[PDB]
Amino acid sequence: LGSPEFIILQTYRAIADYEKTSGSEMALSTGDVVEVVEKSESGWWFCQMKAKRGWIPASFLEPLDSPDETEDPEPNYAGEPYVAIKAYTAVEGDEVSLLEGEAVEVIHKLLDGWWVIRKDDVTGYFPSMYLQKS
Amino acid sequence: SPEFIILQTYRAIADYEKTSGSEMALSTGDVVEVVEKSESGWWFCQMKAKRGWIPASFLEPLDSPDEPNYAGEPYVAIKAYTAVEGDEVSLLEGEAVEVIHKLLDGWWVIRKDDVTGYFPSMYLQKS
């Protein structure tokens, strides 16, 4: 486990495009916002792009090295009881339409938020965010 | 933020366009660091650091676009350099100069005899 540390860096904006001529340099596009790590009287500054951040769909990612090893929990074909807390109308042919308050059996809690559920004789995908444990 | 964190690194396999402000856009091949995993199917990530050396002159403060020296400081060229632009100065190793402005972008204003102009600071040394 690591320890997070925030280093307050001065920020600047690129006024023109810059193309790398050597490996330790960084390309710039007009308007890029960068953080300054170290300044050199040579006129060269060691910088890093101000990183973008935010919520993204897990399903759009794969592990760096073990991309074939699935990280999902195992299915539970016996099923676990949940109830729909918000109605949802299936869009895709493999999705399940539920009304608010309907009870279902969760059989696969996929990491991507689209869980496999069972409702009587029907099986399909349903948003985990619209389900709550009974 | 949190006391401790194990940061996991993943790779984007498809392009993603943000539909709300709290999301992040992705381009295939992007390398991201995962901060928090939600059972909702959303993971909070930051793009892996991209860094390197860049020219100070290509930068400006986030806010805004922004004296004569008659007695220059003695320096000597340590490496030959031939002027590229018309306002640059050509020097051979060993040639002494007067440094007028020690500008931070690596191109100092110098003077030698009846010539003045810009010269790489990295090729000058105090004399």
Binding site: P57, S59, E92, W114, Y125 | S22, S40, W42
Partner: peptide
């Protein structure tokens, strides 16, 4: 808190 809509289906 994550977005208030489910993520897209996998690509």
């Amino acid at each position: 808190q994550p977005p208030s809509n489910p993520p897209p289906r996998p690509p």
